[PDB]
Design a protein around this ligand. Sequence first.
Ligand code: REL
Ligand code: REL
Ligand code: ZN
Ligand code: ZN
Lengths: 413, 413
Amino acid sequence: SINSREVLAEKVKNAVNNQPVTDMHTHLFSPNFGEILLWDIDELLTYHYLVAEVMRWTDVSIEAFWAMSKREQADLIWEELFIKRSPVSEACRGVLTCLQGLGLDPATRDLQVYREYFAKKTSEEQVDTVLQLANVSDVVMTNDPFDDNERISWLEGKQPDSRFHAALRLDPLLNEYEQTKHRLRDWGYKVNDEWNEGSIQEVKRFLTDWIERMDPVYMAVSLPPTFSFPEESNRGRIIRDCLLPVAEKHNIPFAMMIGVKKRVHPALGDAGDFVGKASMDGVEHLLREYPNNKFLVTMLSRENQHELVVLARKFSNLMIFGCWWFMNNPEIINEMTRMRMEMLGTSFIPQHSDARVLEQLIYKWHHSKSIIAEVLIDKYDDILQAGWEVTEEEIKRDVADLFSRNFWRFVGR
Amino acid sequence: SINSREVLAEKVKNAVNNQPVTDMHTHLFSPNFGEILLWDIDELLTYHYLVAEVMRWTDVSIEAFWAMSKREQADLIWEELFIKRSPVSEACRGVLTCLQGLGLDPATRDLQVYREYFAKKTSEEQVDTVLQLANVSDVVMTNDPFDDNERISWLEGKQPDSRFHAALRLDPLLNEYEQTKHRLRDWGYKVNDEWNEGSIQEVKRFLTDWIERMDPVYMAVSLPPTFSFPEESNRGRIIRDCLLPVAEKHNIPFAMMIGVKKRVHPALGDAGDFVGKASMDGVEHLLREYPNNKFLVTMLSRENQHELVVLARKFSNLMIFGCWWFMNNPEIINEMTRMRMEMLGTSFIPQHSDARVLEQLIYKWHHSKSIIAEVLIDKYDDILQAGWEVTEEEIKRDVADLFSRNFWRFVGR
Ligand SMILES: O=C[C@H](O)[C@@H](O)[C@H](O)[C@H](O)C(=O)O
Ligand SMILES: O=C[C@H](O)[C@@H](O)[C@H](O)[C@H](O)C(=O)O
Ligand SMILES: [Zn+2]
Ligand SMILES: [Zn+2]
């Protein structure tokens, strides 16, 4: 039986380590979609998190950086962030965890040798390897139909294998309708100059056509710190007249990733986004006024985290998830996961990888699981010491909810 | 390939229940038009059908009734027609069907709890709820340009959403021209004292102006039992020289609801109209003499129903529809629907709801569909007995024709 923190620690760590993970938000693609799925050490080293970091150290111009080849970029970052300075940051640590996880030894710092490993392997094989090592059963993608490369694949019949699931990303439609409406009409969606019945129906038709083609687990959008709802704006009316009705009809949840301030430093590309605290008014209104709609929410500002948890206490149709981006750091992952558990028990989704490069699934889940395991150990021990019987079976059940079941139960699949 | 009677009944009922309905005559309005759209339990209980019925029981004078507030009128009707006597009449049965459909429970007879349901929703939300429950996809309104409230609404650009369609009601123009002509000139339509070229072209202009503003699926008028045509009167002349030619040009059907005798009991208001049998001469003449015009007809007298069916056998430019008002009772709906199918096959429109209160769509259609399903089952079964085997697809086709396709195909939309 489990009758001590010591015994508990072992059981929790084992259960957490063995629980197959459903990664509900990533930037990975089923291997059959082609090169859009990024992988290998050079891709790991050029993750935009490391681009931002290297630029704080290197005298190499950002324009010169983008001009270099992928290998040149990787060599520079490795040299600047691993050799000239110890790789102690979270993103650098992550690269190391991946290498070790694949059987490569960071002790040698032999980059040329690490590279050879990847060269003698295919995309399909590396996917098998990584999913096995990271113990990830299901990966949810981010599918942007407004991206020409991504859109052509779906239109031409490309479909993910069983391990990969689609999520209809809609940032251009909701946040740039003034420019995006012209593309809809180019694709046959007769949206008019004014927001009338015709415009509302065509936008709904656009969403329905893409839902049928992708069979998404949810529709998503990243939003700025200034997000508000209700709102007399293109976004406010599209959400009110089109997105919500369609989502309820198909019982598809609406995922909102709030707090991103896009391109405060354009020259840095994907690495040029900032953060800002948002008002909870919009989320609060959406949850209260649309009780038949489901909402998946994650916020970027550290200062929004505690109140988001309290908001989940208020509305069952709100399912909070992950420690997103700038929140995806040990210090923050820990505080967020503890506040969440203390006020929500196990009724939340503690994490997602947001993996942009295949191998990251290894470090993202290993770094997170160790922290989540420690929180669970503290929480289980507190009730154990209080006289409660905790069985290994109940631990596996709870761990399964946190890393997989809660999501699937919420999406309705 | 259906050969057993049980499967046949099963497929017919499923097809009827699943078939999205086009309700081609109601007194409902798109929710954006305002409070003109009536809804909720108090509105249901004060429907004029129940006003007439409660007066046969209550000692409360009609004057006092009208003096009462809406909620007080509802309480009296509830007490008098539901508590003091079993609510077995069709209208009272309808209110119950509505409450049950909404998820409310008639068993408790808790009127206050029922009211609480409506109080927590908006008109927009309730229309969404009711259109779904009643599986009604299209509602045809009754739009009267002679009503100040309605007119100004159409003048200020108000447009119904895609679920609602307009029908240009002309009772004041055709039945009260003498008093109405002064309003036509007040609006810039210079009709002359006598019926000449100018008076004819200005009346046409009025019609055309409103057809362009409403884009009605048809033009309508309710007529008395004494209706005649040809006829040297304002109605006879306006119809001959204006209505018909204008209707033919725009290929717009002319709907005539014949048989009502207005205000035989003035104090009852909307619940004070009576019925009388009409001559078929006028309708016979119109169909034969104006073959390029389309006519939608429904009559109020039980005694007019059989010959109307026969008239439809004579003229393809006649499309009979629904079981109107005093005909909208199970006993009459059943005999009417059977006489119609027996002499016209599927070439007619069996029903319309005539809803004045939103929630009525639930009971109007539920009560009618069960009866129409019964008739279909019997007729399909009769040919099955002869050796004919229908396919489930042919059934869905026939059902679609009756509840929606016959109307749109007839109006040409
Ligand atoms: O976590 C960081 C991501 O890789 C971002 O670059 C991304 O834009 C963000 O997660 C999003 O999906 O909107
Ligand atoms: O069913 C009865 C209606 O509510 C009547 O009051 C209405 O005047 C009639 O249907 C009409 O449109 O002439
Ligand atoms: Zn992301
Ligand atoms: Zn009517």
